[PDB]
Write a structure and sequence with these properties.
The structure is cut from a larger assembly and holds 2 copies of chain A (107 residues), 2 copies of chain B, 1 copy of chain C (9 residues), 2 copies of chain D (79 residues) and 2 copies of chain E (92 residues). Chain C has 9 residues and is low in regular secondary structure. Chain C has no helix or strand. Chain D has a single domain, classed as Orthogonal Bundle (Histone, subunit A), CATH 1.10.20.10. In chain D, 58% of the residues lie in helices and 8% in strands. In chain D, α2 crosses α3. Chain D is elongated. Classes of the chains: A mainly alpha (107), B mainly alpha (98), C little secondary structure (9), D mainly alpha (79), E mainly alpha (92). At the F-G interface, α1, β1, α2, β2 and α3 of F face α2, β1, α3, β2 and α4 of G. β2 of chain A pairs parallel with β1 of chain E. Chain A binds a DNA duplex (83 and 83 nucleotides) through α2 and β1. Chain C: This is Chromatin modification-related protein EAF3. Chain C: Component of the NuA4 histone acetyltransferase complex composed of at least ACT1, ARP4, YAF9, VID21, SWC4, EAF3, EAF5, EAF6, EAF7, EPL1, ESA1, TRA1 and YNG2.
DNA sequence: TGGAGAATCCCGGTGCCGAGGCCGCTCAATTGGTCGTAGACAGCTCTAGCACCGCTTAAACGCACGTACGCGCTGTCCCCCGC
DNA sequence: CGGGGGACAGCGCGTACGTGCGTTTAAGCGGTGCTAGAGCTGTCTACGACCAATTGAGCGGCCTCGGCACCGGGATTCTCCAG
């Protein structure tokens, strides 16, 4: 009414809080949805997105590109064992796998 | 004519090095869509499939086949072998629970 | 006494 | 239309195994690969048909395929 | 009509973590589906955690437990640190 | 002390209906109770995500029928929904 | 009012419609819950319970046992193909595994 | 308490294999079996610890144990 | 006596192993002793919340779940040994089963 | 151990197709009140978990000989690969 | 269709648990004692829901563009050499 400042900017988060709160209320996941819970979820989503985008940018620097393609995202996810454990039963479209060569198959 | 023909097994590694890092798809769109129509004909008829749904189905099937082929190759090199067999696929299916 | 092995008792 | 399991091409199966790092492919691999692809495809298509018949729809959308893959724990991104 | 998406927010994250790179539209859809899937998993875990102990609300501890359950290890504890930093920034 | 929700008498009368001379031990009955609770949770979650997909705030018998066709494979679901069908045919 | 009659007897069911409705409403699965959904869920649960207990009794009939023990439930679950497919990721306590021997192991 | 990883005895692993249908048992299977058992046990135990600090509880309940098992898709029936 | 100086019945390697398989896949008892399992449970909680108690029902549930997971892994290992034209199981078979299942 | 075949890499230039940046608007985002209500919170039971000990006996540790499967080396020719 | 090569069977070594026995030892039964927080319920109190008003950045759409992909040329590089 006086000055509408976003609560995501109050916590220093780029990811929204009102959208997360509205989606939590719309799905009826609980009778009440707290105040710090969407902020925590937005911060965790921001950290995950920043880490995955940083790994994808590193892979794009390795293969000399500046635009992140689905192959770069797949390589970033499947490179470290942390995201491999997290995204174990998750597949990514428009992407392959690591170009690993077995020692026995090598001539 | 051919001075060299490339000993067997190394052209396979050439296609491996080309296609593990590749981005374009391998299964052709039209026969996969036709197989989708044949499969859906056994289910409720007068059914349609949009381009995005067919693309998602093709990507999921190719990813599942890639994972199954990786498991099959791992089982083949596990059995002191190099060639993959249908029994290796059956073993991978039994281990994975599918 | 079962010396060494059980045998047929 | 009635016989379309031969539409899955044998060198396409070869390319799929080359993406999987397979060096040597036997001749009996192709038929078993077509069979497992057929049963997986018919399971996912049956799930998508049920999903699109709950919504009183006659065309299957990509979101139906995404939710069908999420039902079996094989969630795919991009759609 | 309107379509809810996280595309522009992910763009701000990208320019705040990598100011010299971009991202394609198919990769944008992949990012949107990834964000939706992680949000779905964490929200379902938090709702289950509230349901198990007769709790009708979702607090910061619900998302704390969901993150320490679903997210593994080092990634999980950095997400925990980021969430606690955001909570402390809100309470300050 | 406090009352606890359980599926004891219902599973027992179903067992007596199908097997008048066969009992059940406590451990196996706890397994059956947990099986009923887990199938209830799975069907409820499937119907919830089906209703959220269609922007539907109402879960009817059609959502339960769709969930039983989805989760339960083969003909085992079909007779089940057929039972549900005659259940509706006995309710209306 | 009038005579109290449960909805399970009206629908020809043994599983409680009202208890299933209560767990559906308090389980925050949806904002609104239909009348036929608890009846359908109770019918499905009753049919599955009857089938599983009948299979357990059949597996325990030749074992000279008139009581259902967890081994009988495990045998009934893993013997049926559709029950094995549905309960693929299900662990049954005090049940073990099926007593099957491979042909190569037998001399 | 400092060292009881040898508590899972070798004949116990032998009986584990005899339930699993194994005919002959090697001497190097025990260390890897104990290692993967330790990994799975510590994963489920850390999940149960997260569940028990969710509700300010110092003890671990079997209900939380089967919930943690259901979280990883290995749900246990009868507790 | 025993047909002269002789020796025990002396079953060949494998026969009493299938006897153990037959008698031991149907008695559905517990294969790991409870106190060593509880001691191992308390050991691997020392890098965790240290002052933590464990219920008897929770200990039994964890023991049963780990036992079932281990016998499923042993079934996978035996099928991988038969896959490799072998009878004995190797730790590399366990690694293969865990990698195919997604746990390695 | 210096030439071919095939194959990938590099480079300059160009088509162009999404990629990225900018303006109105709105509907979802933010702000300001109450208020039942669910969640902390603190004083009670007391349930079941933790700790120590006698005994024993069946599970378990270590040793003794053996054979049967694991492993090393060959041949066929049939199946698979390169074109 | 021509060539490669290795799966499977065979033969031979080998060795290490298999089975059993002598010896150890702690799992478990049973008991007693202590006690930490599950759990229970009354009480206080901020908090999210709800609603009215307001304003504001994402959405839709549009304009310009620039790196992705590709088409010509040229080389580094794997492979198999017969030497």
């Amino acid at each position: 009414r006086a000055k509408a400042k976003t609560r995501s900017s109050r916590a220093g988060l780029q990811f929204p809080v009102g959208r997360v709160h509205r989606l939590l209320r719309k799905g009826n996941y609980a009778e009440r949805v707290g105040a710090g819970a969407p902020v925590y979820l937005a911060a965790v989503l921001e950290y995950l997105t920043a880490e995955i985008l940083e790994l994808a940018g590193n892979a794009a620097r390795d293969n000399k590109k500046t635009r992140i393609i689905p192959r770069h995202l797949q390589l970033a996810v499947r490179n470290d064992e942390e995201l491999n454990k997290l995204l174990g039963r998750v597949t990514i479209a428009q992407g392959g796998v690591l170009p690993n060569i077995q020692s026995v198959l090598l001539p | 004519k051919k001075p060299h023909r490339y000993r067997p097994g190394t052209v396979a590694l050439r296609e491996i090095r080309r296609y593990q890092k590749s981005t374009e798809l391998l299964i052709r769109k039209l026969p996969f869509q036709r197989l989708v129509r044949e499969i859906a004909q056994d289910f409720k008829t007068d059914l349609r499939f949009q381009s995005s749904a067919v693309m998602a189905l093709q990507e999921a099937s190719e990813a599942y086949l890639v994972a199954l082929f990786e498991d099959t190759n791992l089982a083949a090199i596990h059995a002191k072998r190099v060639t993959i067999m249908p029994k290796d696929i059956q073993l991978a299916r039994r281990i994975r629970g599918e | 006494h079962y010396q060494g092995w059980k045998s047929s008792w | 239309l009635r016989d379309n399991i031969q539409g899955i091409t044998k060198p396409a199966i070869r390319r799929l195994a080359r993406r999987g790092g397979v060096k040597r492919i036997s001749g009996l691999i192709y038929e078993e690969t077509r069979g497992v692809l057929k049963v997986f495809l018919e399971n996912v298509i049956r799930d998508a048909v049920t999903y699109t018949e709950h919504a009183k729809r006659k065309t299957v959308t990509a979101m139906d395929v995404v939710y069908a893959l999420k039902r079996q724990g094989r969630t795919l991104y991009g759609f | 009509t309107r379509k809810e998406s996280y595309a522009i927010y992910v763009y701000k994250v990208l320019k705040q973590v990598h100011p010299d790179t971009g991202i394609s539209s198919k990769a944008m859809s992949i990012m949107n589906s990834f964000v939706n899937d992680v949000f779905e998993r964490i929200a379902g875990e938090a709702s289950r955690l509230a349901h198990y102990n007769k709790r009708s609300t979702i607090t910061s501890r619900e998302i704390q437990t969901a993150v320490r359950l679903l997210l593994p290890g080092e990634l999980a504890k950095h997400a925990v640190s980021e969430g606690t930093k955001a909570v402390t920034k809100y309470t300050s």
